[PDB]
Ligand binder design. Structure first.
Ligand SMILES: [Ca+2]
Ligand SMILES: [Ca+2]
Ligand SMILES: [Zn+2]
Lengths: 123, 123
């Protein structure tokens, strides 16, 4: 669930997802349209694409399981659908951490809407 | 720290996953100027004032101590400066939660900046 996704960002990226990734670029935030503006923005585009390929459960409200093996996050596989949800959040959290080197809020925080008007890239 | 502030929002508002406070009104988000547009927005104005009235520690990166006795967040530790930071966060979180009935993101999410170019009133 979004609550877990939110907690995963703090655990893996060791940063606040609400105050650093809820209005970034063209896809980091609710919804999304246009083209991802950078690496962090592509992470969100992929996450949106991931949630959209999940069938058999709800990626926003359904809760999944996960543990910590060696400071890393492992998703529970007992329930097949929910593991697919965890993977979407897990892969996004790691994507944010690996791209911190180029995180550019100075430019993309509250990025003008006119910049995200193009038709979105296919998933 | 921002991570703790976010964690306190998740714990108090019990719905921090769908109610964001990163770009709401004139004061819920980075910076702040003009005047509170509503109740939630006033919660952020008072919070910004609370962070501005602190010296001796950093409210952004310093971590404070706190417990969850029952359902409340009790600020503790043995540092007046950090317990101050915790109180700024504790109050704001409750404020957000007590004003959920008025939360209006349809209107105030990504509120145009030109609507906040008035000089702010004193704290
Ligand atoms: Ca999005
Ligand atoms: Ca503010
Ligand atoms: Zn379109």
């Amino acid at each position: 669930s979004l609550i877990q996704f939110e907690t995963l960002i703090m655990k893996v990226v060791k940063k606040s997802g609400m105050f650093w990734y809820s209005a970034y670029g063209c896809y980091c935030g609710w919804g999304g349209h246009g083209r991802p503006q950078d690496a962090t923005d592509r992470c969100c585009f992929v996450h949106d694409c991931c949630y959209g390929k999940v069938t058999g459960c709800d990626p926003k409200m359904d809760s999944y399981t996960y543990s910590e093996e060696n400071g890393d996050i492992v998703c529970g596989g007992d329930d097949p659908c929910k593991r697919e949800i965890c993977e979407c959040d897990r892969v996004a959290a790691d994507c944010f951490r690996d791209n911190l080197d180029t995180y550019n809020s100075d430019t993309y925080w509250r990025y003008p809407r006119q910049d995200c008007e193009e038709s979105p890239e296919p998933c």
